[PDB]
Curated annotation (Swiss-Prot):
Binding site for ATP 1: D116, Y354, S356, G385, K386, S387, T388, E509
Effect of F289A: Increased ATPase activity and enhanced activity stimulation by brassinolide, but reduced brassinosteroid exporter activity
Family annotation (PANTHER family): ATP-BINDING CASSETTE TRANSPORTER, ATP-DEPENDENT PERMEASE MDL1, MITOCHONDRIAL
Record-given protein name: ABC transporter B family member 19
Effect the entry attributes to changing M296A: Strongly reduced ATPase activity and reduced activity stimulation by brassinolide
Cysteines joined through disulfide linkages: none
Taxonomic lineage: Eukaryota, Viridiplantae, Streptophyta, Embryophyta, Tracheophyta
Protein encoded by which gene: ABCB19
Natural source organism: Arabidopsis thaliana (Mouse-ear cress)
Length: 1166
């Protein structure tokens, strides 16, 4: 993008802030250096403990000192960590707050030229909020984290290198081998996952189409073929899921095996060194662990880099507005001061063009004069948003051509604020910034009293009007309870204009809201303050411009003439037509749902139990190895070490043999459940009622997206967690049993202090993700003010209150800074206190153990075999607690999303014992039926409606341009339910019939060209499923669409729609006719595309539909004013009431009645 330079984000601090930077850096360095020191202390103490095996009166002597050393190290770590966290977080917060202050201060400094509604104004809110959050997070946490881990790296590397000079190279040699497997695993898993998430979409599009056109699929209901295709695709998805699970298991197993093999190698070769007379045991131990931890510290270190570059991208596109110079500003040394303002305006040859883009000329030689105290106004040729004529009054845009003067005095040399207080301006948008009404009134004049406010309200007819509220006249404009525009607020701005009392006040096209009492009243209120005002009103609508005694006629952009509307009627002035036109206007039964897979899962738990034994075995054997080194015979340790190396290689093979089994069998539990829950969920969705789809959020583009994520969430929520919990619990339980069997008198202290150790290890884990916690949860309150302010730049420019806005913004930052200041301490101190214990308890345990020997019964063993095999498991068990948010805090909603799985339907598709449907003549009667739109309950559509077909008469219905009649046909089919009334079919109500059979018998035609994703042959074949292609060809002949498909090379086999050919014209509806003739139903419905089908060749459509009704009497509902072929039935029904039960062929004789409103179009206005 640009330079995006670092070390430039740190350019807004002071001498009171750099000290925090230095203290934080020192703390991070100390922490990082301290982490590998503990290994050196442990190794030195182990060496000292072992070297005096038969010299009892040295244990306490050389153990108490190291206990003191441990407590010292704990204190140092506590203080360093607390200091680093507090200093870094507070400094970052302060820097970002200062940057926001400067940015918002500079935002209003420039003019509105940069501000246009071309998504730039929307861009500003985003580039404030998200950009500031990104910068803050990036610097304030990642810099400290990076420094800490780099220090850990360097200290570990140096302390490892200078121990023995030999074991370090071997220790570091094994790292690239592990990293190779670690990278290959990630690459293969990511590739397989990316490949997998493609087959599902192949039927996800089918599902999206199905829910997209539910109103059609219920007609000709198959509701099963789509489900079969969905199952077919989900089968392949299941296969790829099995493959992915098997690959993941095998990869993890082989990685752990290679790690175990490397451990065996390093231990054997170190042991070869041990009895070669070159080094001791404990120093080798600390060398190995220090080198490994130093090498591995880089893994979590460089990961902080990812945000850093983004921060640089955040650095630019911000602060760029800071150094932008506007056009004009109130220069203090202007030296201009005028009195006796009259309000004379002199424009000279004004021709302007929009700087954003050259376009049609705004004006040409526009040189009008405005006399003082008159009602002069101007109007454009077609409106064209000429309100900018007053913009030059406020001077948003500099005049390029000529010059502008006020009262014969040039407006440029004078100070900008001078003309501000000669300007009274109101904007069309009546709503204003969210603030209490009294403060909003105060913007007219700062030091205003209650008497002035009530006088202005009386002038604006607002006194005792807004008072009819529960609040004591302290409501806020932005409050949602007074969200009504113009109801009670009545455009407070005019009142505050009365508070300002400017020399000249300007208006706009505020009458667009309505023409009623309130705005008329404010109109004569404006006319009351018209004295001493050269008020100019510019509006696209010119109905209420009679009061203006000076109007200018301009159409091409050049001023033509001025005068009065009374004499403008001569020659029509190109204005008579305009005025004439204006006057003419949770886990309860998920496993129960998983019951069918009774096998393939218990073996998974067996594999988990078998795999959980790797940890304690490794710890026990390593402790035996660290014990055996102190044998002093220089013989017979070779056999023991060979046996221990063999057991390492056997265990390394065991992980490969176990993880594969576990993560292959659990893949079945994770995938079969998803495949069997998706189908059930979709089946439940399909059988829902129609009105459930009417909600905007309940969209066809939303249900499928929700389904895709929530189906996959179940596998993670209900399958992996069981395995993880079982593995960790069995590992811990085995470890404690081994500890107790080995020794009992020491384990009491460990079991007592275990919660503290696991708490410290848990805090170490949270240290990685950052202690900043949630952001913008309480930091967005100022951002909302900033975003709202930057929207109404034009409004804020009028009635200049930039200082007040800046003061409010400055005062609003007191909350987040205080919260961050509290958070820094309450996090750092607690973290330090926790980190003290993890090393303090070490001293207690080991001092007690050392005091046990030489005073009681124990040896060098049974004090390490109880220490190192419980510290490891205490470290391990922390992950179970760390996974708590996912199972309960995260899985309670996404894991329980199947509310649609058991939601009860309004109308029951699958009837139990409803009456069957036999050969039926199909006569429908309505008796006082009631209906309304479920989406809008406030709208009354049909009340006590009555309608009936006499005896098999071809009925035609008036359309009235489709004014709500489209529901009538939907009343015959079981789309919705009547509110109250009787819908009789064949002497019985429609509510007591097996709706599937009736749907098979109901005939209906849609008025949309959308169709399915299959080929055209399947499109015709959809109706009357299972029909031979011969009758399909016959129906194609009848529909007269053979030419429409023969031109295409593929003929009947061409795919149509998306990923296929596209056809134009209304022939697709004709294709639906081909479907209808396949049904040839005993009951049929018809409809026409109202105000949509503007294509020609409607005669073919009329002939085809006439051919459709040859064998059966049908009913037609259409908006077509002509081409009605119904017999003795026109049924003119309007206003939700029956007003005509006659015939069109005989209603022509009626001069007055329903025919008068029927004669509205019907003949000529076609």
């Amino acid at each position: 993008e640009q330079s995006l330079p670092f070390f430039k984000l740190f350019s807004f601090a002071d001498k009171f802030d750099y000290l925090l930077m230095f203290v934080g850096s020192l703390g991070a360095i100390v922490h990082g250096s301290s982490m590998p020191v503990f290994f050196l202390l442990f190794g030195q103490m182990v060496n000292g403990f072992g070297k005096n095996q038969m010299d009892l009166h040295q244990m306490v002597h050389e153990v108490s000192r190291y206990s003191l050393y441990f407590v010292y190290l704990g204190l140092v770590v506590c203080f360093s960590s607390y200091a680093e966290i507090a200093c870094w977080m507070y400094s970052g917060e302060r820097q970002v707050a200062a940057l926001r202050k400067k940015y918002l201060e500079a935002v209003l400094k420039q003019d509105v030229g940069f501000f246009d509604t071309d998504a730039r104004t929307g861009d500003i809110v985003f580039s404030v909020s998200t950009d500031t959050l990104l910068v803050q997070d990036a610097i304030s946490e990642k810099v400290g984290n990076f420094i800490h881990y780099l220090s850990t790296f360097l200290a570990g590397l140096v302390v490892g290198f200078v121990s023995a000079w030999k074991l370090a190279l071997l220790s570091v040699a094994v790292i690239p081998g592990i990293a190779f497997a670690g990278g290959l695993y990630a690459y293969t898993l990511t590739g397989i996952t990316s490949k997998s998430r493609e087959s599902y979409a192949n039927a996800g599009v089918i599902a999206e189409q199905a829910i997209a056109q539910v109103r059609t699929v219920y007609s000709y209901v198959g509701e099963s073929k789509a489900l079969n295709a969905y199952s077919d695709a989900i089968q392949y998805t299941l296969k790829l899921g099995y493959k992915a699970g098997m690959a993941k298991g095998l990869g993890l197993g082989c990685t752990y095996g290679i790690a175990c093999m490397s451990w065996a190698l390093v231990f054997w070769y170190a042991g070869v060194f041990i009895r070669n007379g070159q080094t001791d045991g404990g120093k080798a131990f600390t060398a190995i662990f220090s080198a490994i931890v130093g090498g591995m510290s880089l893994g979590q270190s460089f990961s902080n880099l990812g945000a850093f570059s983004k921060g640089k991208a955040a650095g630019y596109k911000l602060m760029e507005i800071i150094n932008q110079r506007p056009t004009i500003i109130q220069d203090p040394l202007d030296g201009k001061c005028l009195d006796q303002v009259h309000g004379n305006i002199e424009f000279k040859d004004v021709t302007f063009s929009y700087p954003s883009r050259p376009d049609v000329m705004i004006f040409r030689n526009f040189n009008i004069f405005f006399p003082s105290g008159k009602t002069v106004a101007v109007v454009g040729g077609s409106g064209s948003g000429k309100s900018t004529v007053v913009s030059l009054i406020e001077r948003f845009y500099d005049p390029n051509s000529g010059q502008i003067l006020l009262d014969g005095v040039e407006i440029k040399t004078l100070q900008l604020k001078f003309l501000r207080e000669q300007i009274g301006l109101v904007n069309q948008e009546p709503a204003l910034f969210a603030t209490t009404i009294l403060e909003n009134i105060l913007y007219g004049k700062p030091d205003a009293t209650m008497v002035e406010v009530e006088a202005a309200a009386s002038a604006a007819n607002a006194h005792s009007f807004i008072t009819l509220l529960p609040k004591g006249y302290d409501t806020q404009v932005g409050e949602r309870g007074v969200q009504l525009s113009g109801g009670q607020k009545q455009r407070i701005a005019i009142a505050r204009a009365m508070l300002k009392d400017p020399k000249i006040l300007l208006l706009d096209e505020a009458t667009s809201a309505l023409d009623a009492s309130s705005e008329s009243i404010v109109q004569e209120a404006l006319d009351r303050v018209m004295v001493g005002r050269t008020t100019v009103v510019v509006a696209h609508r010119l109905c209420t411009i009679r009061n203006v005694d000076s109007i200018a006629v301009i159409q091409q952009g050049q001023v033509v003439e001025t005068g009065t509307h009374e004499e403008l009627i001569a020659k029509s002035g190109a204005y008579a037509s305009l005025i004439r036109f204006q006057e003419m206007v949770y886990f309860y039964r998920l496993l129960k749902l998983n019951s069918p897979e009774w096998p393939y899962s218990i073996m998974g738990a067996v594999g988990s139990i078998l795999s959980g034994f790797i940890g304690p075995t490794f710890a026990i054997v390593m402790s035996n190895m660290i014990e055996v080194f102190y044998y002093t015979d220089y013989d017979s340790m070779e056999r023991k070490t060979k046996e221990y190396v063999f057991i390492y290689i056997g265990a390394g093979l065991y992980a490969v043999g176990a993880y594969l089994i576990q993560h292959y069998f659990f893949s079945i539990m994770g995938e079969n459940l998803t495949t069997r829950v998706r189908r059930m969920m979709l089946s439940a969705i399909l059988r829902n009622e129609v009105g459930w789809f009417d909600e905007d959020e309940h969209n066809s583009s939303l249900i499928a997206a929700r389904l895709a994520t929530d189906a996959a969430d179940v596998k993670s929520a209900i399958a992996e967690r069981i395995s993880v919990i079982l593995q960790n619990m069995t590992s811990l339980l085995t470890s404690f049993i081994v500890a107790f069997i080995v020794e009992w008198r020491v384990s009491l202290l460990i079991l007592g202090t275990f919660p503290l150790l696991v708490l410290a290890n848990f805090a170490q884990q949270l240290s990685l993700k950052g202690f900043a916690g949630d952001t913008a949860k309480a930091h967005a309150k100022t951002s909302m003010i900033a975003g709202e302010g930057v929207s109404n730049i034009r409004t804020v420019a009028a009635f200049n209150a930039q200082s007040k806005i800046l003061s409010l913004f400055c005062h609003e930052l007191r909350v987040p800074q205080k919260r961050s200041l509290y958070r820094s301490q309450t996090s750092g101190f607690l973290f330090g206190l926790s980190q003290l214990a993890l090393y303090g308890s070490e001293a207690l345990i080991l001092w007690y153990g050392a005091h046990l020997v030489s005073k009681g019964v124990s040896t060098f063993s049974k004090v390490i075999k109880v220490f190192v095999v419980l510290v490891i498991t205490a470290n391990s068990v922390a992950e179970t607690v760390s996974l708590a948010p996912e199972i309960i805090r995260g899985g309670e909603a996404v894991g329980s999303v199947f509310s649609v799985l058991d939601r009860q339907t309004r109308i029951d598709p699958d009837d139990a014992d409803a009456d069957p449907v036999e050969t039926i003549r199909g006569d429908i009667e309505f008796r006082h039926v009631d209906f309304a739109y479920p989406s809008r309950p406030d709208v009354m559509v049909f009340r006590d409606f009555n309608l009936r077909i006499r005896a098999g008469h071809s009925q035609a219905l008036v359309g009235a341009s489709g004014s709500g009649k489209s529901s009538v046909i939907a009343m015959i089919e079981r789309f919705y339910d009547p509110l109250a009334g009787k819908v009789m079919i064949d002497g019985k109500d429609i509510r007591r019939l097996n709706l599937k059979s009736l749907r098979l018998k109901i005939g209906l035609v849609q008025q949309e060209p959308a169709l399915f994703a299959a080929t055209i042959f399947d499109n015709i074949a959809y109706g009357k499923d299972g029909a031979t292609e011969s009758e399909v060809i016959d129906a194609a002949r009848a529909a007269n669409a053979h030419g429409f498909i023969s031109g295409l090379p593929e003929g009947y086999k061409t795919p149509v729609g998306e990923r296929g050919v596209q056809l134009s014209g209304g022939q697709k509806q004709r294709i639906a006719i081909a479907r209808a003739v396949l049904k040839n139903p005993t009951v049929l419905l018809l409809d026409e595309a109202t105000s949509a089908l503007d294509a020609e060749s409607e005669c073919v459509l009329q002939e085809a539909l006439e051919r459709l009704m040859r064998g059966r009497t049908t009913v037609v509902v259409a908006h077509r004013l002509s081409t009605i072929r119904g017999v003795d039935c026109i049924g003119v029904i309007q206003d939700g009431r029956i007003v005509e039960q006659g015939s069109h062929s005989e209603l022509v004789s009626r001069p007055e009645g329903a025919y008068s409103r029927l004669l509205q179009l019907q003949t000529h206005r076609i």
